Amino acid sequence: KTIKSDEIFAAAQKLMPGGVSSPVRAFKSVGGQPIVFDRVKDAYAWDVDGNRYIDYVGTWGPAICGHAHPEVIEALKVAMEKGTSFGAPCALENVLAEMVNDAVPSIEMVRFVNSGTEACMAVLRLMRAYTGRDKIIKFEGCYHGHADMFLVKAGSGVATLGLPSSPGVPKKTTANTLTTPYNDLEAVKALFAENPGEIAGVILEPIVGNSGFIVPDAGFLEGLREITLEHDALLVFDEVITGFRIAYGGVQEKFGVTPDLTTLGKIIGGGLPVGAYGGKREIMQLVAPAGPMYQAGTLSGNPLAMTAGIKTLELLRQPGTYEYLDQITKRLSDGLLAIAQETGHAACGGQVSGMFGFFFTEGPVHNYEDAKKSDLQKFSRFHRGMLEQGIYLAPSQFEAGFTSLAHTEEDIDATLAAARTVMSAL
Amino acid sequence: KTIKSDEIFAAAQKLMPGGVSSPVRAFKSVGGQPIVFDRVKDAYAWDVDGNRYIDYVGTWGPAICGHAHPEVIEALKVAMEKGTSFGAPCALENVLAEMVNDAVPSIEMVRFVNSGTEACMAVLRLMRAYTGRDKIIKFEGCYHGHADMFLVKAGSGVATLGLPSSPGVPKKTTANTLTTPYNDLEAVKALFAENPGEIAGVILEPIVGNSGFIVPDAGFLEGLREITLEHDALLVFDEVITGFRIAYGGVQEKFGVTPDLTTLGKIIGGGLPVGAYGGKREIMQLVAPAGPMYQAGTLSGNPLAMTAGIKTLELLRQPGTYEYLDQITKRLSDGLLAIAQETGHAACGGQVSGMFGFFFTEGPVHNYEDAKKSDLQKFSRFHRGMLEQGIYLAPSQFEAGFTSLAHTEEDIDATLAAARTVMSAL
Numbered sequence: 001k002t003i004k005s006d007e008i009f010a011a012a013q014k015l016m017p018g019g020v021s022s023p024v025r026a027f028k029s030v031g032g033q034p035i036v037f038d039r040v041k042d043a044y045a046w047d048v049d050g051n052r053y054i055d056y057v058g059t060w061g062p063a064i065c066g067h068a069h070p071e072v073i074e075a076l077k078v079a080m081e082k083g084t085s086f087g088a089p090c091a092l093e094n095v096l097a098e099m100v101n102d103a104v105p106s107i108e109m110v111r112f113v114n115s116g117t118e119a120c121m122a123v124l125r126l127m128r129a130y131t132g133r134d135k136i137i138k139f140e141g142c143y144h145g146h147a148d149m150f151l152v153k154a155g156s157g158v159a160t161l162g163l164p165s166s167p168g169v170p171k172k173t174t175a176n177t178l179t180t181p182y183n184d185l186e187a188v189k190a191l192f193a194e195n196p197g198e199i200a201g202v203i204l205e206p207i208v209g210n211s212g213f214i215v216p217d218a219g220f221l222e223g224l225r226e227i228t229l230e231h232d233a234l235l236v237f238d239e240v241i242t243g244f245r246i247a248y249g250g251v252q253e254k255f256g257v258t259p260d261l262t263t264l265g266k267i268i269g270g271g272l273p274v275g276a277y278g279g280k281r282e283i284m285q286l287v288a289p290a291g292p293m294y295q296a297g298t299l300s301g302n303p304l305a306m307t308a309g310i311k312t313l314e315l316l317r318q319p320g321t322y323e324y325l326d327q328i329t330k331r332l333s334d335g336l337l338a339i340a341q342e343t344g345h346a347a348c349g350g351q352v353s354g355m356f357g358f359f360f361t362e363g364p365v366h367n368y369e370d371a372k373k374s375d376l377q378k379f380s381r382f383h384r385g386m387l388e389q390g391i392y393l394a395p396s397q398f399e400a401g402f403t404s405l406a407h408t409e410e411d412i413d414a415t416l417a418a419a420r421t422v423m424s425a426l
Numbered sequence: 427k428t429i430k431s432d433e434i435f436a437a438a439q440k441l442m443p444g445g446v447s448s449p450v451r452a453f454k455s456v457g458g459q460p461i462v463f464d465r466v467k468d469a470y471a472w473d474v475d476g477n478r479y480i481d482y483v484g485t486w487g488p489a490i491c492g493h494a495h496p497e498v499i500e501a502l503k504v505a506m507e508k509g510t511s512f513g514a515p516c517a518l519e520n521v522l523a524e525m526v527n528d529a530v531p532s533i534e535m536v537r538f539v540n541s542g543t544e545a546c547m548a549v550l551r552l553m554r555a556y557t558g559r560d561k562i563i564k565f566e567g568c569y570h571g572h573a574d575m576f577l578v579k580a581g582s583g584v585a586t587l588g589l590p591s592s593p594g595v596p597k598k599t600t601a602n603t604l605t606t607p608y609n610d611l612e613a614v615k616a617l618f619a620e621n622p623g624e625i626a627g628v629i630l631e632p633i634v635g636n637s638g639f640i641v642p643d644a645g646f647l648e649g650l651r652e653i654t655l656e657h658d659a660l661l662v663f664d665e666v667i668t669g670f671r672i673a674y675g676g677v678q679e680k681f682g683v684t685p686d687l688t689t690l691g692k693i694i695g696g697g698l699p700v701g702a703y704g705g706k707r708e709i710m711q712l713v714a715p716a717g718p719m720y721q722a723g724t725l726s727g728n729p730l731a732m733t734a735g736i737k738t739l740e741l742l743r744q745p746g747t748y749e750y751l752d753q754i755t756k757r758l759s760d761g762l763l764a765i766a767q768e769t770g771h772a773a774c775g776g777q778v779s780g781m782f783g784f785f786f787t788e789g790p791v792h793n794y795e796d797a798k799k800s801d802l803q804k805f806s807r808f809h810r811g812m813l814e815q816g817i818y819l820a821p822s823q824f825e826a827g828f829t830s831l832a833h834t835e836e837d838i839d840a841t842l843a844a845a846r847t848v849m850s851a852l
């Protein structure tokens with residue numbers, strides 16, 4: 001039963017567009033019956049109707065240490081006694097900044113913002129100001145925030161319902177954005193050859209999460225690194241989802257490729273609204289007040305967000321953190337793929353650390369186009385069935401799933417048991 | 427003494443651009459020595475060195491009820507026990523949304539975001555999508571976040587730092603931003619006459635705060651309302667600063683002019699990162715997932731921000747709230763102007779509710795150009811002198827000052843006494 005949710009969502013539709021603060025939450029691609037959360041803790045989420053779920057969304061990435069972690073909460077209660085926002089510098093900004101610099105290879109200087117969208121927006125402007133060029137290359141199926149003159153063929157909630165991008169933004173403004181298929185080096189080389197001295201750089205999700213879970217093919221990241229250097233263009237990694245999840249130093253640390261600039265978000269805020277962008281010192285020097293490129297933020301670097309980020313990173317620095325994530329996630333992933341086979345359903349997927357994907361198609365999936373061959377109607381029934389079995393999964397075939405340090409071996413087994421029950425039907 | 431601040435700021439400059447998360451905190455135009463806050467409460471702020479100040483910045487607008495208000499803090503402690511972020515709908519979103527709709531005249535449907543920048547960015551895209559036109563009119567000296575099209579004749583930091591239209595912004599996109607001086611109706615009419623059928627609408631600060639405190643001349647707002655209707659263009663009010671401060675319903679309520687869309691921020695977050703944009707239902711229907719215009723936000727509508735906003739608005743709904751603000755602020759404003767006269771310094775200013783301005787120039791100030799005639803060197807000495815006397819003012823001549831419900835009659839008197847001491851020197 002979802003009586004209270006239906007009631008609250010119905011009322012919500014009269015107050016907010018589509019009745020949500022964010023598109024993907026409306027469940028448009030899986031039925032249209034969203035459930036309203038009341039509280040979350042560890043690896044679970046609870047309904048406004050009392051239903052308990054094993055959560056695989058983790059508020060979309062931030063809850064890697066588990067929901068309402070006791071130490072994060074405790075640190076927040078103590079900090080807010082001093083005020084939630086200053087509007088002036090505080091020591092905690094220095095602490096988190098230093099922690100981020102040590103953690104992320106390419107980051108020598110950082111700037112805190114309030115969301116991944118603000119960070120990506122700032123990084124685009126910075127790419128152009130530093131190179132003096134206007135064109136940017138992005139990949140189909142990737143999402144870097146709703147940046148006006150750039151938001152085109154984005155993933156996330158956009159691809160959730162087959163939505164393209166925009167409108168609003170003029171066609172002239174979006175002419176400075178080039179697109180190519182993810183994992184396609186040749187397409188990228190062609191774009192440079194065809195636009196000599198006009199590409200500021202390339203921005204991408206080192207590991208895709210907004211058009212399903214997609215890993216880069218061998219030599220793809222290395223390839224992009226080489227071609228950008230060859231044309232004095234910048235290589236920008238959007239690690240808003242991957243940062244601190246794939247590895248403490250993100251994908252750039254794990255796979256050994258160092259970008260010039262990287263954006264961070266989610267986990268770095270420990271649950272609160274936070275974003276960040278940084279990279280080579282010579283580039284960050286253009287950011288005001290040090291440089292001419294203007295970018296500001298009233299609540300940027302507020303003590304509460306800083307406190308939550310610091311505590312979250314300290315927890316991740318503990319022994320066996322990423323080993324545990326990889327272990328339970330592989331068990332979850334393989335298990336799902338074994339069950340699909342045993343029940344006769346074509347499927348593929350995979351995982352790296354605490355991030356996984358599962359598509360209802362034989363694949364393999366190398367790009368957004370491949371991802372779109374998935375049987376969306378089957379995913380819809382699968383999703384509803386799992387929900388009824390007490391498992392909460394992203395309400396979209398084009399969203400990667402997430403695991404946390406709070407998920408236990410038993411939670412995993414219970415999820416597999418539920419998946420067998422569900423797929424046996426379908 | 428500011429030993430600890432100098433030490434922390436020095437280290438900060440090696441970790442973050444200019445050593446700050448936001449340009450204005452820089453103190454560039456006032457000496458260069460920012461003070462690092464440790465805590466804030468009621469109407470005061472405390473140094474990392476132990477110096478206590480009577481705060482007139484209020485973290486730039488949010489702290490209208492005073493810093494660390496007991497009821498807001500208490501409501502936050504209880505709420506976070508349930509988790510800081512869900513990534514799914516929650517009942518609290520419905521509550522705040524409804525409160526905002528009742529409070530703001532033009533708002534029939536609302537969408538929550540994470541900052542004023544995100545709200546203004548969404549509202550620009552919406553203006554264009556709804557009208558099918560690309561050009562926008564903004565005023566010199568106004569600030570609507572750091573979205574690209576807005577970095578033209580921007581106020582706030584850009585003004586303070588004497589920066590030009592920001593670099594890294596394609597000429598293509600900037601070409602769609604038309605500007606005009608504030609309070610100049612004729613200039614606005616000319617822009618329409620010169621661009622038939624291309625203006626989506628006009629966006630402005632109903633009462634300016636980012637190029638000093640500037641009130642609209644008689645008939646200016648009414649004039650803009652009439653010309654926009656005449657050409658089927660939209661009138662957009664950026665009430666990120668004015669919302670809930672000038673009046674419960676903002677400037678639109680106070681001055682009787684109803685826009686088509688309005689952006690909110692600061693106060694609505696009660697100290698946490700929050701933004702919002704809403705207006706006529708027929709326009710908000712284009713926002714995804716209800717409409718084609720895509721705009722998302724991971725932490726948008728999170729329970730902690732919602733809880734803080736709700737509590738803050740309930741406090742403001744209490745009897746005598748705005749009367750008290752107007753009373754103590756007028757007393758502060760007039761007092762400052764009386765002291766400048768008595769000590770022989772040319773000055774002008776004013777206030778509306780809990781928002782005031784003070785310029786070192788005879789004025790009057792009707793626009794950004796007038797504001798720039800202010801003696802910045804004198805302001806610099808005035809600012810430092812006040813700081814040494816225990817009064818914390820915005821580190822810029824182009825930033826409006828703020829008052830709170832926690833400021834007492836005695837705090838005001840102590841500020842006037844300090845101003846006499848300071849201006850007697852200079």
Ligand SMILES: Cc1ncc(COP(=O)(O)O)c(CN)c1O
Pocket residue numbers: 115116117118120143144145156205209210238239240241265266722723724725
């Ligand atoms: C790769 C990437 N970049 C940017 C963002 C924007 O994040 P936020 O909502 O925090 O602005 C997201 C969230 N979908 C993302 O996945």
Ligand SMILES: Cc1ncc(COP(=O)(O)O)c(CN)c1O
Pocket residue numbers: 296297298299541542543544546569570571572582631635636664665666667691692701
């Ligand atoms: C009128 C106005 N609009 C929008 C903003 C952007 O606010 P935020 O820092 O919340 O992005 C500001 C503050 N710079 C503002 O003063």
Ligand SMILES: Nc1cccc(C(=O)O)c1
Pocket residue numbers: 087088296297298299300447448449450451485486582583
């Ligand atoms: N842009 C802008 C406006 C006001 C305050 C701030 C801030 O960092 O405190 C930034």
